[PDB]
């Protein structure tokens, strides 16, 4: 259960293809009401996750 | 950790003990297996394996199925194993592009063999449940000094010459046939011929390749008079 931007980034270093931790990051950004930031990191999730996981795409 | 005999999503945990190394004061390397469901002919009679050990080759598959059948009095003849890309060097088919990870597929000879080894691995899962010593030990073919200098080996001029010769030969053949096809005056069913520029070679390449005046009319000059006045 990550709570800050630094441990969020470190857990994305854990897995950058993890749609789970991507989703928790953008969900935290919606609850803190930074919608452009959550949308942009969703684009970052697009350009960072792999091509085998069409389900998580 | 002992009652974890299978997974609820259909997979079955397959453990493997590891020897007492000199620098380490035993493990159970866990694999997962589930029968395959595919429509292709060469991917029938197949077993999906997840979390295979290093260099999980046909010889070690033979060793494991031999252990299983010699324990459980089954018969299960391995035919071939698929998708052994354990390093991540074949995920993009660049060749056909410009013209299933950490897991593999295991094809057998018949459904009798696959259900026999399936029951054998179910009993192996029950072994992991009740008695963790009656399991098998996984030996790696050890990547040693000789195998790494084998990777460092300079290439053979005979292999190079023969491979380049056959590859170039079949490439000239298919390219000549492609040129004949694309410039052989194609005509559709209804009379409809295609225009081809000179020095084009591929129909696939063809598919990939795939004023007013304001002062003239009287209504115009009248609206101009209106917007000026």
């Amino acid at each position: 259960a990550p709570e800050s931007v630094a441990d969020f980034e470190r857990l994305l270093i854990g897995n950058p293809n993890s749609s789970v931790v991507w989703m928790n990051y953008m969900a935290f950004q919606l609850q803190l009401s930074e919608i452009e930031k959550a949308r942009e990191l969703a684009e970052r999730a697009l350009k960072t996750i792999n091509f085998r996981e069409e389900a998580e795409k | 950790i002992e009652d974890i005999s299978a997974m609820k999503n259909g997979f079955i945990v397959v453990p493997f003990k590891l020897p007492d190394h000199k620098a380490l004061p035993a493990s159970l390397h866990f694999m997962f297996a589930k029968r395959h469901q595919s429509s292709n002919s060469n991917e029938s009679d197949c077993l999906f394996l997840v979390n295979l050990p290093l260099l999980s080759n046909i010889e070690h598959m033979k060793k494991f199925v031999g252990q299983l059948c010699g324990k459980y009095d089954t018969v299960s003849h391995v035919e071939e194993l698929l998708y052994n890309d354990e390093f991540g060097l074949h995920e993009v088919d660049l060749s056909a592009l410009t013209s299933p990870r950490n897991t593999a597929l295991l094809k057998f000879v018949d459904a009798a063999s696959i259900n026999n080894c399936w029951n054998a691995l179910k009993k192996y899962s029950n072994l992991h449940a009740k008695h963790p010593n009656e399991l098998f030990e996984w030996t790696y073919t050890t990547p040693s000094f000789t195998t790494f200098v084998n990777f460092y080996k300079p290439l053979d001029i005979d292999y190079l010459k023969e491979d380049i010769h056959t590859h170039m030969a079949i490439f000239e053949q298919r390219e000549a046939q492609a040129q004949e096809d694309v410039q052989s005056s194609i005509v559709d069913e209804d009379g409809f011929t295609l225009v081809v520029g000179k020095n084009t070679k591929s129909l696939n390449s063809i598919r990939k390749k795939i004023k007013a005046k304001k002062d003239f009319y009287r209504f115009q000059v009248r609206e101009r008079k209106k917007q000026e006045i």
Binding site: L11 | H21, H29, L54, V92, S99, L155
Partner: protein
């Protein structure tokens, strides 16, 4: 000018509102100084008294008279002493109303001016007015002490003696406070100055050419001291008049004060081994004189209607273009325009005629030279239109570390002893004329040591400074002067440390050339032969010249300049001095040394091995260009790190265990449009070309050896072939074919790939163009800029060595290392260009530690000293950086960002790098600069910064290869042929690099690794020891859902949730390196 005008002026006003003072502190010290005025007028007077009378007085008083040296003696005091009510005045940045809130602590001057009816016209001879001043201030501090013991402020007041900016002829009073007049929180102090009125002694009798101590040579410091104490206040009146005449005087004043403070400059006496002589006061006088004139025509170069930035740019360009010491000087009238004359008085000379004073007599010639060089550099960065330089100019203190401020440095211990011990300790003499030219022995020895070192070095350096290690300026009330006894002396120091701005193209000159030779010995050759003695001789050269010189011998552990200063200060100064720089000694030892003849005598500026490599390569070049083929050989371009002078070690023949043995050479054929249009057929045509070249080479150049290596270092191209060539110069190359068809087929695959396949193929094409296209232009411009900046190649060699010791080379690429190493040379600001290995390496690490890649980008102007980046390209690269940091604001995909003319994208040498590696490198630089800040620079700290940490590592695998490879690798503690079998070449090769790489390609989803790449330098003594340090990614450290593409070796904690299988991973590492794993250490 408008854009920089707006940004510079908003930065100026921001800085001044940041550093603005405290008006409550102003009112506090104002009512305090008013109280001191009342205390002064309560203080009574003392009549005409003799030496015995004042001796009895200050003998039964606890206060002792701080007499100037030498003391007054009863045989030559027939005159007497007196104290009357002085005249009061106020001096300082406070008096010019331009104060700030200094964090360390400021001080405000107040002048007590002596009475004329106490003076006589025979008081400026032989310390008469000086002893007058000494007993004057003695009585002042005594009666101030008794009036303090009356008013009872003694519980928090602190009264101490001091000197007027360290002027031993001018002792002053210092007042500080501690925790209703408690002014300690203000961080202010009070200086009581004691001066003479305007026109008490004749200024043409007190010009620095005049003699005023009879025993004839001039007494310049004596002249200036008494004349400045005579004409302090008229200068202050003139500064106030010019400040009211113009509008931004206080603003130009505070910019100048902050600039000199960041440079490490002040109004302190610089003649005794200190950096000073020019500070805020002389800055204000210079502003007044330049608004009074300045030109040789005596025109008004500085306009009164200027702005703050305008006045500041004017003074910095004027001091950059105008010599005040050697061939010119400036002259003004405080009461009459300023005019520049082409006569330099061999001293910084700004000469007031209205009072006949040169104002920069506190300056040395070397201090004036480095001040002019700082002026020229800051003029340059003020004409820097492309990049902003404000934060570099004002927001960086350059005087924090002497090894960073100066390229070379040496510590010399001086056990000189005593006043009678100098005659048998010092080689030189200290007579009556020596004492009258330097009243103070510190000034004597300082000017002596600067003169002898400057003559003994000359062209070999640019600039020279000396730091008298142990100087103080304060001493208590109960003392006559400052007293110190440590360091083998009775003077105010421990030892000396000489600092040097060196010339890199004039350091490795092996001969110290002097004058010519005739039959009649000239004066120059005469004094040259006397100065060099035994070392001097007469040599002839091939051109037919007979000139005196002396010849040294280079070394791989110390420079010729070190040897010369050793001989010079051990000969011409004292036989008891001790000279070293063990720091640069261990730097040169830790620099890798090649297995070559005369490597011990080989210095650091010899690229001879590189040149032999280039010559053998040019031979092979000629052979291939005369070879015939179905194509015509269009081009052959090397791209090797040894070609661009940046490999970790200089290349050795037959040392094929070198990781940089096989240099890369890009072979490129003519544009035959019959290439195959498919990637594999194109690749196999490349292989067939290389095979044809190999057959012809084995046919007609049989002295060379040749084979094919299956390269797949680029992703998804399983058929790369490098033609390895072995040449009987003991060298090796790998040939590969470049093609425009490779470029277009990569772009076609990019366009044909799926939308989720696009970033992977983009990364593949980025790696391809990094290897094939930007690499050639990079090695080209790096060669050129290295030959312009010699010391870049040793500093990048030692930096890459340091990264190999810290195991970051498994991720960091050599090109990125080269760029971060060339950053301080192409960006010297605010310092100078590095000319020493230590100076360059520490500038590199200082910039890396101060860097913030999350916010700060990096663009480098790859250009020779004065094809730079234009404003349009600079704006374009800044837009590239802002869009990339908008697309990645935290650095998951890209941490660093370095761009140039070669790379308008800035992403080429930075991709494929984890942020753990990034923060580990940044923290390594940070802990390096912290240990340098705390523990002090020594060889122990050198060893601490060179040892790897081996910490924060979740597993540590200690491996050792069974064969030693150091001697075969060619670093001194040797091969002489190529063995018969290329399979045995591969046998003697080293495997742990491919080990850690393939293990990373397996577990890149889960694990990250770091290894040692260069075993011949980081394998201990035998060159056989390595370590794999591995971190687990935190998500796979956690426990998650068992997926079909989970991509890990897991152990289930539930029937659906799995955690990673750590000991199985460790067993897999042991299996992969079974023959080489010697020890394992878990977290």
């Amino acid at each position: 000018e408008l854009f920089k005008s707006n940004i510079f002026k908003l930065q100026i006003d921001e800085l001044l509102e940041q550093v603005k003072l405290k008006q409550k502190h102003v009112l506090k010290v104002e009512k305090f100084l008013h109280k001191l005025y009342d205390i002064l007028q309560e203080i009574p007077d003392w009549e005409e008294k003799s030496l015995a009378e004042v001796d009895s007085f200050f003998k039964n008083k606890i206060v002792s008279v701080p007499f100037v040296d030498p003391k007054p003696i009863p045989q030559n005091t027939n005159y007497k002493f007196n104290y009357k009510k002085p005249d009061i005045s106020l001096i300082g940045s406070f008096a010019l109303k331009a104060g700030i809130y200094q964090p360390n602590g400021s001080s405000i001057d107040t002048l007590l001016t002596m009475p004329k009816e106490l003076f006589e016209k025979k008081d400026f001879l032989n310390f008469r007015c000086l002893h007058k001043r000494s007993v004057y201030l003695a009585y002042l501090t005594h009666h101030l002490l008794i009036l303090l013991k009356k008013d009872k402020l003694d519980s928090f007041l602190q009264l101490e003696y001091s000197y007027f900016d360290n002027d031993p002829l001018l002792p002053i009073l210092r007042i500080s406070c501690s925790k209703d007049y408690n002014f300690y929180k203000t961080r202010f102090s009070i200086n009581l100055l004691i001066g003479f009125p305007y026109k008490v002694f004749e200024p043409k009798k007190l010009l620095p050419n005049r003699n005023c101590i009879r025993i004839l040579p001039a007494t310049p410091l004596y002249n200036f001291s008494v004349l400045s104490s005579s004409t302090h206040e008229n200068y202050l009146k003139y500064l106030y008049k010019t400040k009211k005449q113009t509008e931004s005087f206080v603003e130009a004043t505070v910019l100048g004060r902050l600039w000199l403070q960041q440079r490490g400059f002040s109004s302190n006496m610089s003649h005794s081994g200190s950096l000073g002589g020019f500070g805020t006061f002389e800055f204000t006088i210079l502003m007044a004189a330049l608004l009074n004139g300045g030109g040789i025509n005596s025109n008004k170069i500085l306009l009164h209607g200027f702005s703050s930035y305008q006045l500041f740019k004017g003074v910095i360009k004027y001091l950059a273009t105008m010599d005040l010491c050697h061939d010119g000087h400036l002259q003004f009238h405080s009461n009459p325009a300023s005019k520049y004359i082409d006569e330099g008085f061999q001293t910084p000379t700004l000469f007031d005629k209205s009072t006949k004073v040169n104002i920069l007599t506190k300056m040395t010639v070397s201090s004036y030279q480095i001040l002019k060089e700082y002026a020229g550099e800051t003029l340059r960065m003020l004409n820097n239109v492309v990049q902003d330089q404000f934060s570099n100019i004002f927001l960086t203190n350059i005087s924090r570390f002497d090894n960073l401020k100066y390229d070379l440095c040496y510590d010399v211990q001086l056990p000189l002893g005593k006043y009678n011990n100098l005659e048998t300790s010092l080689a030189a003499t200290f007579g009556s004329m020596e004492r009258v030219k330097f009243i103070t022995l510190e000034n004597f020895l300082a000017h002596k040591i600067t003169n002898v070192a400057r003559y003994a070095l000359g062209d070999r350096i640019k600039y020279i400074q000396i730091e008298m290690v142990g100087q103080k300026s304060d001493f208590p009330i109960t003392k006559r002067k400052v007293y110190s006894n440590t360091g083998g002396n009775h003077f105010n120091f421990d030892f000396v440390r000489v600092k040097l701005i060196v010339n890199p193209s004039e350091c490795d000159k092996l001969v110290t050339k002097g004058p010519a030779h005739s039959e009649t010995m000239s004066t120059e050759a005469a004094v040259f032969k006397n100065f060099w003695g035994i070392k001097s001789s007469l040599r002839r050269f091939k051109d037919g010249s007979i000139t005196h010189c002396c010849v040294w011998s280079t070394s791989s552990s110390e420079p010729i300049i070190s040897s010369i200063v050793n001989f010079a200060l051990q000969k011409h100064v004292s036989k008891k001095a001790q000279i070293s720089n063990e720091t640069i000694k261990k730097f040169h030892n830790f620099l890798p040394l090649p297995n070559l003849p005369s490597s011990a005598k080989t210095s650091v500026l010899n690229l001879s091995s590189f040149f032999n490599l280039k010559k053998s390569f040019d031979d092979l070049y000629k052979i291939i260009f005369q070879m015939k083929l179905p194509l015509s050989v269009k081009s052959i371009l090397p791209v090797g790190s040894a070609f661009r002078y940046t490999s970790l070690c200089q290349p050795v023949p037959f040392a094929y265990s070198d990781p940089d043995f096989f240099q890369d050479v890009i072979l490129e054929f003519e544009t035959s449009p019959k290439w195959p249009d498919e990637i594999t057929s194109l690749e196999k045509a490349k292989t067939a070309f290389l095979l044809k070249i190999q057959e012809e080479l084995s046919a007609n150049s049989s002295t060379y050896r040749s084979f094919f290596s299956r390269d797949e270092s680029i992703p998804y191209n399983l058929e790369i072939v490098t033609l390895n060539i072995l040449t009987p110069e003991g060298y090796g190359f790998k040939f590969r074919v470049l093609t425009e068809r490779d470029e277009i087929l990569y772009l076609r695959a990019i366009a044909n790939a799926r939308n989720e396949l696009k970033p992977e193929l983009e990364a593949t094409f980025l790696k391809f163009t990094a290897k094939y296209l930007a690499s050639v232009r990079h090695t080209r411009t790096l060669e050129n800029i290295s030959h312009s900046y010699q010391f870049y190649s040793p500093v990048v060699r030692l930096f890459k060595r340091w990264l190999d010791t810290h195991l970051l080379l498994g991720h960091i690429t050599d090109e990125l290392a080269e760029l971060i190493a060339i950053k301080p040379f192409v960006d010297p600001a605010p310092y100078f260009i590095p000319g020493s290995l230590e100076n360059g390496f520490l500038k590199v690490l200082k910039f890396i530690s101060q860097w913030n890649w999350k916010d700060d980008p990096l663009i480098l102007d790859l250009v020779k000293p004065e094809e730079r980046l234009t404003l349009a390209q600079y704006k374009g690269i800044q837009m590239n950086f802002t869009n990339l940091r908008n697309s990645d604001p935290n650095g998951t995909h890209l941490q660093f960002f370095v761009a140039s003319k070669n790379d308008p994208s800035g992403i080429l040498y930075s991709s494929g790098i984890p942020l753990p590696i990034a923060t580990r490198l940044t923290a390594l630089a940070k802990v390096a600069v912290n240990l340098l800040q705390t523990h002090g620079l020594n060889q122990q700290t050198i060893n601490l910064l060179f040892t790897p940490g081996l910490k924060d590592y979740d597993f540590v695998v200690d491996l050792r290869t069974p064969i030693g490879l150091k001697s075969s690798c060619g670093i001194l503690s040797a091969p002489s042929n190529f063995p018969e079998n290329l399979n045995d070449l591969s046998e003697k090769m080293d495997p742990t690099y491919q080990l850690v790489k393939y293990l990373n390609l397996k577990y890149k989803n889960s694990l990250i690794l770091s290894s040692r790449k260069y075993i011949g330098v980081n394998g201990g003594e035998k060159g056989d020891k390595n370590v794999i340090t591995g971190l687990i990614k935190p998500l796979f450290k956690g426990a998650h859902k068992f997926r079909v593409n989970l991509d890990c070796n897991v152990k289930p904690v539930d029937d659906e949730n799995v955690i990673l299988n750590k000991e199985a991973i460790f067993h897999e590492i042991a299996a992969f390196g079974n023959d080489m794993v010697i020890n394992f250490e878990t977290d």
